[PDB]
C-alpha cells in the first residue's frame, strides 16, 4: 500500500503498492485527461506514459 | 520509514510475508526453521504447538 | 485480454498521432496503419484493430473525424 491518500487521487470524479510513470497517485482516466493537452506530468519532472 | 517517506512504493508483500520461525513441538515420542507464508503460519504453529488439533482451534 | 486492451490505447496513440500529422490518406490506409502498428505489440483481429483506432477519441485525449467513416483525425 502507498501512503498517498486513496480518498482523493486527482480531478477525475471517479474515486481511487502500484507503480506508474509519474508517481502522482492518479487514476487512468485522470492521466488520460491530463495527457490530452501536455504529455509531461507536472508531478515528478519525468516523462509519463502510464502503466497497468 | 514508510511514514517518513509518504507516497513511496517501498513495502513488502502482505500476502507473501517471508518469515522463518522456530516452532516449538512436543519433542520425540532436530529442530529447523520452517518456511511458511504469513497468513498460513498461524494454523501450522497451532498444530505444531501441541498434539491435539481441531477445526475450531 | 486485459493486457491487450490496456496496450491497445498505447498502440493506437501512435496511429492517431501519425493520422493527425498526415490528415490525408485513404480510408483503408488508416485502418491498415493501425493494424500494422498493433501487430508488433500483439495479434488483434481486424475488428479489434478498427475498434482501437475508433476509440482514440473516447480516450479523452483527442477527437475523431465524423466526415469519413474510416479515416480518423486527432485534434490533439
Swiss-Prot record, chain A:
<feature type="binding site">
    <location>
        <position position="9"/>
    </location>
    <ligand>
        <name>Zn(2+) 1</name>
    </ligand>
</feature>
<feature type="binding site">
    <location>
        <position position="44"/>
    </location>
    <ligand>
        <name>Zn(2+) 3</name>
    </ligand>
</feature>
<comment type="function">
    <text>E3 ubiquitin ligase component of multiple cullin-RING-based E3 ubiquitin-protein ligase (CRLs) complexes which mediate the ubiquitination and subsequent proteasomal degradation of target proteins, including proteins involved in cell cycle progression, signal transduction, transcription and transcription-coupled nucleotide excision repair. CRLs complexes and ARIH1 collaborate in tandem to mediate ubiquitination of target proteins, ARIH1 mediating addition of the first ubiquitin on CRLs targets.</text>
</comment>
<comment type="subunit">
    <text>(Microbial infection) Interacts with human adenovirus 5 protein E1A; this interaction inhibits RBX1-CUL1-dependent elongation reaction of ubiquitin chains by the SCF(FBW7) complex.</text>
</comment>
<feature type="binding site">
    <location>
        <position position="12"/>
    </location>
    <ligand>
        <name>Zn(2+) 1</name>
    </ligand>
</feature>
<feature type="binding site">
    <location>
        <position position="29"/>
    </location>
    <ligand>
        <name>Zn(2+) 2</name>
    </ligand>
</feature>
<feature type="binding site">
    <location>
        <position position="27"/>
    </location>
    <ligand>
        <name>Zn(2+) 1</name>
    </ligand>
</feature>
<feature type="zinc finger region" description="RING-type">
    <location>
        <begin position="17"/>
        <end position="45"/>
    </location>
</feature>
<protein>
    <recommendedName>
        <fullName>E3 ubiquitin-protein ligase RBX1</fullName>
    </recommendedName>
</protein>
<feature type="binding site">
    <location>
        <position position="41"/>
    </location>
    <ligand>
        <name>Zn(2+) 3</name>
    </ligand>
</feature>
<comment type="similarity">
    <text>Belongs to the RING-box family.</text>
</comment>
<feature type="binding site">
    <location>
        <position position="24"/>
    </location>
    <ligand>
        <name>Zn(2+) 3</name>
    </ligand>
</feature>
<comment type="subunit">
    <text>Component of multiple Cul1-RING E3 ubiquitin-protein ligase complexes commonly known as SCF (SKP1-CUL1-F-box) complexes, consisting of CUL1, SKP1, RBX1 and a variable F-box domain-containing protein. Part of a SCF(SKP2) complex consisting of CUL1, RBX1, SKP1 and SKP2. Part of a SCF(FBXO3) complex consisting of CUL1, FBXO3, RBX1 and SKP1; this complex interacts with PML via FBXO3. Component of the SCF(Cyclin F) complex consisting of CUL1, RBX1, SKP1 and CCNF. Identified in a SCF E3 ubiquitin ligase complex together with HINT1 and CDC34.</text>
</comment>
<feature type="binding site">
    <location>
        <position position="22"/>
    </location>
    <ligand>
        <name>Zn(2+) 3</name>
    </ligand>
</feature>
<feature type="binding site">
    <location>
        <position position="30"/>
    </location>
    <ligand>
        <name>Zn(2+) 1</name>
    </ligand>
</feature>
Curated annotation (Swiss-Prot), chain C:
<feature type="domain" description="Cullin neddylation">
    <location>
        <begin position="6"/>
        <end position="68"/>
    </location>
</feature>
<comment type="subunit">
    <text>Forms neddylation-dependent homodimers. Component of multiple BCR (BTB-CUL3-RBX1) E3 ubiquitin-protein ligase complexes formed of CUL3, RBX1 and a variable BTB domain-containing protein acting as both, adapter to cullin and substrate recognition subunit. The BCR complex may be active as a heterodimeric complex, in which NEDD8, covalently attached to one CUL3 molecule, binds to the C-terminus of a second CUL3 molecule. Interacts with RBX1, RNF7, CYCE and TIP120A/CAND1. Part of the BCR(SPOP) containing SPOP, and of BCR containing homodimeric SPOPL or the heterodimer formed by SPOP and SPOPL.</text>
</comment>
<protein>
    <recommendedName>
        <fullName>Cullin-3</fullName>
    </recommendedName>
</protein>
<comment type="function">
    <text>Core component of multiple cullin-RING-based BCR (BTB-CUL3-RBX1) E3 ubiquitin-protein ligase complexes which mediate the ubiquitination and subsequent proteasomal degradation of target proteins. BCR complexes and ARIH1 collaborate in tandem to mediate ubiquitination of target proteins. As a scaffold protein may contribute to catalysis through positioning of the substrate and the ubiquitin-conjugating enzyme.</text>
</comment>
<feature type="cross-link" description="Glycyl lysine isopeptide (Lys-Gly) (interchain with G-Cter in NEDD8)">
    <location>
        <position position="20"/>
    </location>
</feature>
<comment type="similarity">
    <text>Belongs to the cullin family.</text>
</comment>
Amino acid at each position: 500500500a502507498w501512503d498517498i491518500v486513496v480518498d482523493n487521487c486527482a480531478i477525475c470524479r471517479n474515486h481511487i503498492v502500484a507503480w506508474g510513470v509519474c508517481n502522482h497517485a492518479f487514476h487512468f482516466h485522470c492521466i488520460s485527461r491530463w495527457l490530452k493537452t501536455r504529455q509531461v506530468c507536472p508531478l515528478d519532472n519525468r516523462e509519463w506514459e502510464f502503466q497497468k | 520509514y514508510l511514514a517518513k517517506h509518504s507516497g513511496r512504493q517501498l513495502t513488502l508483500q502482505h500476502h507473501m510475508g517471508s518469515a522463518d520461525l522456530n516452532a516449538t513441538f512436543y519433542g520425540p515420542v532436530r529442530k529447523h526453521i520452517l518456511q511458511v507464508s504469513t497468513f498460513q503460519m498461524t494454523i501450522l504453529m497451532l498444530f505444531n504447538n501441541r498434539e491435539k488439533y481441531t477445526f475450531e482451534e | 485480454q486485459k493486457v491487450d486492451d490496456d496496450r491497445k490505447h498505447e498502440i493506437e496513440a501512435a496511429i492517431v498521432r501519425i493520422m493527425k500529422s498526415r490528415k490525408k490518406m485513404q480510408h483503408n490506409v488508416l485502418v491498415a496503419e493501425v493494424t500494422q502498428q498493433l501487430k508488433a505489440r500483439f495479434l488483434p483481429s481486424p475488428v479489434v484493430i478498427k475498434k482501437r483506432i475508433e476509440g482514440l477519441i473516447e480516450r479523452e485525449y483527442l477527437a475523431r473525424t465524423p466526415e469519413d467513416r474510416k479515416v480518423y483525425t486527432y485534434v490533439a
